[PDB]
Amino acid sequence: ATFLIKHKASGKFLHPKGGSSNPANDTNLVLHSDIHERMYFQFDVVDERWGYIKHAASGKIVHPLGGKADPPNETKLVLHQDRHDRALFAMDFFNDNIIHKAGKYVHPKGGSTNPPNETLTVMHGDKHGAMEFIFVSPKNKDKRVLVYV
Amino acid sequence: MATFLIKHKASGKFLHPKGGSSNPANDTNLVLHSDIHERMYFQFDVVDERWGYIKHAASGKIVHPLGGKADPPNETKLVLHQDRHDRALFAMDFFNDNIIHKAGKYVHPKGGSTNPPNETLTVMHGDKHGAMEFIFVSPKNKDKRVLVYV
Ligand SMILES: CC(=O)N[C@@H]1[C@@H](O)[C@@H](O)[C@@H](CO)O[C@@H]1O
Ligand SMILES: CC(=O)N[C@@H]1[C@@H](O)[C@@H](O)[C@@H](CO)O[C@@H]1O
Ligand SMILES: CC(=O)N[C@@H]1[C@@H](O)[C@@H](O)[C@@H](CO)O[C@@H]1O
Ligand SMILES: CC(=O)N[C@@H]1[C@@H](O)[C@@H](O)[C@@H](CO)O[C@@H]1O
Ligand SMILES: CC(=O)N[C@@H]1[C@@H](O)[C@@H](O)[C@@H](CO)O[C@@H]1O
Ligand SMILES: CC(=O)N[C@@H]1[C@@H](O)[C@@H](O)[C@@H](CO)O[C@@H]1O
C-alpha cells in the first residue's frame, strides 16, 4: 500500500523537508499542506504491528534522530536509509496515532492543532487530538487505506 | 493468508464453533474453549480498510450476529454462517485488543467474566472492559501475536 500520512487536526501531511525524491540521510520530517509523490509513504511490516515507515520515493525510513532506542520527548524525526530495531513503529489506525517501539508518539513540535507548513515532527509521550494521524489514499485524501498490506 | 487463534486475553481461552466441527451448521454458536486444534483456527478477509469477515478456517463460514441485523442489540449471540454481507463486517482492533462490529458493539463472553468456563457463549455488547479483550496469536505459539490483516 502507498498512502499519505495526514495530521488529523490540520489536514497537513508528513513530508521530507524540501520534498526531494532522494532526501539526504537525516533530513527532517515536517508537516506541509502539499500533496505530491515525494510525500507518499509505505509501511514494511517486520513483526506483527511493528515495521518501518518508508518514504516511497527514496526508500529511506523514519528514524528518531540519532537512532536512540528510547528517544526522549522532543527528539526530531528524520529519514535515514539504515534498517534497525530503533526505527520500528506501529501505525495505530484504531486510535489514529503513530507509536514508536519504545512507546512515544509522533507529534508536531509544539502540539498545535494547526501547525504551519514546515513545522518539525518530534517524538512525545503525550496523547491528545493534535497528535492524531490518519492514513489516506494519494487519490482521495479523505479515504482511509489499510497500511498493513 | 494469516491463520490465527482468537484468544480471550483475560482467561486464555479461545474462540471455537460450539462442538468443534470442521463444518459447523449455519447459525452454530461461537463459544470459548481451552483446546487448540485446526477446527478453531480463524482467518480475516479484508473488505474495506479495517472492515472484513472473520472466517472459520476449516469451514469457510464467517462470524455473524445471529439473525444478521445491521444494528444488533446487546446480548445478540455470535454465530457462524456462510453468507457474506455487510452486517457481518468486523474490525480486528489489535491496538486496543478487541473485536468490533460495524455498528460499534464488541465481542464479549456472555456475562463478562474474566475466567469464563469452557462452552461459554459469545455475544455482542457495547461495554468495554478487560473481559472483552482479545488478542490474535499464532497457531504455533499461543503467546505470539500475529498480524491478521495479511
Ligand atoms: C516546489 C516544491 O518542491 N515544494 C516542496 C513542497 O511541496 C513540500 O514538499 C516542502 C516540504 O518541506 O518542500 C518543498 O518546498
Ligand atoms: C551509527 C549509528 O548509530 N547510526 C544511526 C543511524 O542508523 C540512524 O538511526 C540515524 C538516524 O538519525 O542515527 C544514526 O546516525
Ligand atoms: C501543553 C501542550 O500543548 N503540550 C504539548 C505536548 O502535549 C506535545 O504535543 C508537545 C510536542 O512537541 O508540544 C507541547 O508541549
Ligand atoms: C475432540 C474435540 O474436537 N472436541 C471439541 C473441543 O476441542 C472444542 O472444539 C469444543 C467446542 O465446543 O467442541 C468439542 O468438544
Ligand atoms: C434471510 C436473512 O436475514 N438471513 C440472515 C443470514 O444472512 C445471516 O446473517 C444469519 C446469521 O445468523 O441471519 C439470517 O439468517
Ligand atoms: C458484568 C456486567 O456488569 N456486565 C456484563 C457486560 O459488561 C457484558 O460483558 C455482558 C455480556 O453478556 O455481560 C454482563 O452483562
Residue numbers in the entry:
A (entry chain B): 1 to 149
B (entry chain A): 0 to 149
What did the paper state?
MytiLec, a lectin isolated from the Mediterranean mussel Mytilus galloprovincialis, was identified through a study of marine organisms and their adaptation to different habitats and environmental systems, and shown to bind α-D-galactose and N-acetyl-α-D-galactosamine (α-GalNAc). The structure is well ordered, with the entire main-chain of each monomer visible in the 2mFo-DFc electron density map, revealing a β-trefoil fold consisting of three related sub-domains. MytiLec is somewhat unusual in binding ligand at each subdomain, and it forms a dimer in solution, giving a total of six ligand sites per protein.
In order to understand how MytiLec binds to galactose and GalNAc, and whether the acetyl group contacts the protein, co-crystals of MytiLec and GalNAc were grown. These crystals, in space-group C2, diffracted to slightly higher resolution than the apo crystals, and also had a dimer in the asymmetric unit showing identical interactions between partner chains. Six GalNAc molecules were identified in the electron density map, and were sufficiently ordered for the electron density map to show a large hole in the centre of each ring. The very high-resolution diffraction data allowed the GalNAc ligands to be placed unambiguously at three sites per polypeptide, related by the pseudo-symmetry of the protein sequence. The principal side-chain contacts made by MytiLec with GalNAc are all charged, with the ligand cradled by three histidines and two carboxyl groups. Five hydrogen bonds form between the protein and each of the six ligand molecules. A HxDxH motif is found in each sub-domain, the first histidine (His 32, His 80 or His 124) lying against the sugar ligand but making no hydrogen bond with it. The axially positioned O4 atom makes two hydrogen bonds to histidine residues, the first residue of the HPxGG motif and the last one of the HxDxH motif. D-glucose differs from D-galactose only in the position of this epimeric oxygen, so the structure implies strong selectivity for galactose over glucose. The C2-N-acetyl group of the ligand points away from the protein and makes no significant contact with it, indicating that galactose will bind as well as GalNAc with the same binding mode.
